[PDB]
């Protein structure tokens, strides 16, 4: 205790570029959070109820490289900044948060687990302000309840003068509506 995290790198520069072009990833997948990369950007994805969710501003319309070839997005909502792919085999699927605690954590690509106070449906305040450079590349990362269940994914940072005091996220609620709609 409390909730902790660590990261493991699975691919280098060259392999990432090649896998990007082939759409074929034969690597073993593990963990609740995937670190994703495109040609130009890196960011996060969180697997919830068998779908790997991330931000449209990272992934765009792109396929995800997979064991059988490129995986087509099963959910794409541009205005909500949300996309999802069926989770590849091996990703650890998270449970949505029920209880409704307002005491949250944000897990960053650096595998830090940072206290957040939920201020509304889609917003939470960083209890200790962070430099924006620290949060960059963490979009798609999970916001968790104290139990470790997921409330949503990191979308955007509210920042001034290079410091972020709060975060906007996409609630698991928005995932179900997106699934219900399509």
């Amino acid at each position: 205790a409390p909730i902790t995290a660590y990261s493991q790198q699975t691919r280098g520069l060259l392999g990432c570029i090649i896998t990007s072009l082939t759409g074929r990833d034969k690597n073993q997948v593990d963990g609740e959070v995937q670190v994703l990369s495109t040609a130009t950007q890196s960011f996060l994805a969180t697997c919830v109820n068998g779908v790997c969710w991330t931000v449209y501003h990272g992934a765009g319309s792109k396929t995800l490289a997979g064991p059988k070839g490129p995986i087509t997005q099963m959910y794409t909502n541009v205005d909500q900044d949300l996309v999802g792919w069926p989770a590849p085999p091996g990703a650890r699927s998270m449970t949505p948060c029920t209880c409704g605690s307002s005491d949250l954590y944000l897990v960053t690509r650096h595998a830090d687990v940072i206290p957040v106070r939920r201020r509304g449906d889609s917003r939470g305040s960083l209890l200790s302000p962070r430099p924006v450079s620290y949060l960059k590349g963490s979009s798609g990362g999970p916001l968790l309840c104290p139990s470790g269940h997921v409330v949503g994914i990191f979308k955007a940072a509210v920042c001034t003068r290079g410091v972020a005091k709060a975060v906007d996220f996409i609630p698991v609620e928005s995932m179900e509506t997106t699934m219900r709609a399509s």
Binding site: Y6, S20, N27, G31, V35, V107
Partner: peptide, 13 residues
């Protein structure tokens, strides 16, 4: 115009 690629993962405890 390529695919998104998994380059790493984070394991939660």
């Amino acid at each position: 115009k390529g695919s998104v690629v998994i380059v790493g993962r984070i394991i939660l405890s």
